[PDB]
Amino acid sequence: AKIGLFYGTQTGVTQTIAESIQQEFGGESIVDLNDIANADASDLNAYDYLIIGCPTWNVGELQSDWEGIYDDLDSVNFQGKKVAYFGAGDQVGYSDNFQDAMGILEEKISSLGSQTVGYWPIEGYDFNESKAVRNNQFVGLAIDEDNQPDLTKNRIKTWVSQLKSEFGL
Ligand SMILES: Cc1cc2nc3c(=O)[nH]c(=O)nc-3n(C[C@H](O)[C@H](O)[C@H](O)COP(=O)(O)O)c2cc1C
């Protein structure tokens, strides 16, 4: 598969989202699904297209497995890659740090030469601050299973449709 999806998860939500994204794209032959806990930073070199999934924990921190590999990201040549992002969060309980992890990863990876694609509009959300917002859009798909579980299915389908174009599908 030419698209590699790497996710990290504490309670399983981001994994569930990752599986739905893969299925939406068309399955295993279209997207490779990988838990970043089992990966090496160099594994990211194999793809032209990447999807990065990461929930925000402990008031604005990266999920643990992403935190562990964070410093090794500098060794990956992101030049020429197109990268999309998704994250799970809680806009009510963490209004001032909603989806911060997604924003932190995007900032690091884009500065290494990749092009971010898959921007998502902020309509329908209610939060005060987020490190994942640029030009009044989220840098990736913001999922909130804690407060908006009913919006998830549709958010994923719509986001994947738009991404397909960018990934030459
Ligand atoms: C103690 C705690 C701290 C959290 N901190 C944040 C946060 O800073 N920002 C945010 O958007 N969501 C935060 N959340 C919400 C989680 O990201 C959310 O529950 C998500 O679904 C967890 O995904 P996971 O199962 O993939 O780890 C927090 C959740 C808990 C229980």
Q: What is the CATH number of the domain that holds 28?
A: 3.40.50.360
Closest of 132, 62, 136, 77 to residue 103, by C-alpha: 132
Range of the domain at 14: 1-169
152 in ligand 1 pocket by Cβ < 6 Å? no
Please name the residue that has the structure tokens 């197109």: 82
In this structure, what token pair is assigned to residue 130?
A: 């987020």
Closest of 131, 130, 129, 123 to residue 148, by C-alpha: 123
* SS3 annotation, the chain: CCEEEEECCCCCHHHHHHHHHHHHHCCCCCEEEEEHHHCCHHHHHHCCEEEEECCEECCCEECHHHHHHHHHHHHCCCCCCEEEEEEECCCCCCCCCCCHHHHHHHHHHHHCCCEECCCEECCCCCCCCCCCEECCEECCEEECCCCCHHHHHHHHHHHHHHHHHHCCC
Cα gap 28→97, rounded to integer Å = 33
Nearest CA to ligand 1 atom 16: 89
Experimental technique used?
Answer: X-ray
Q: Are 31 and 7 a contacting pair, CB within 8 Å?
A: no
- Which amino acid, residue 153? K
Cα diameter, the chain = 39
Residue 86, strand partner residues: 53, 141
42 in ligand 1 pocket by Cβ < 6 Å? no
**All residues at 6 or more sequence positions from 74 whose CB lies less than 8 Å from its CB, including other chains:** 112
Neighbouring CB atoms inside 10 A of 96's CB total 12
In this structure, what token pair is assigned to residue 141?
A: 């798909």
Closest of 40, 104, 49, 45 to residue 72, by C-alpha: 40
Distance 96 CA to ligand 1 centre (A): 12
The count of structural domains within the chain is 1
Distance 152 CA to ligand 1 centre (A): 16
Main-chain dihedrals φ then ψ at residue 78, nearest 5 degrees? -90, -5
99 in ligand 1 pocket by Cβ < 6 Å? yes
Cα gap 152→103, rounded to integer Å = 20
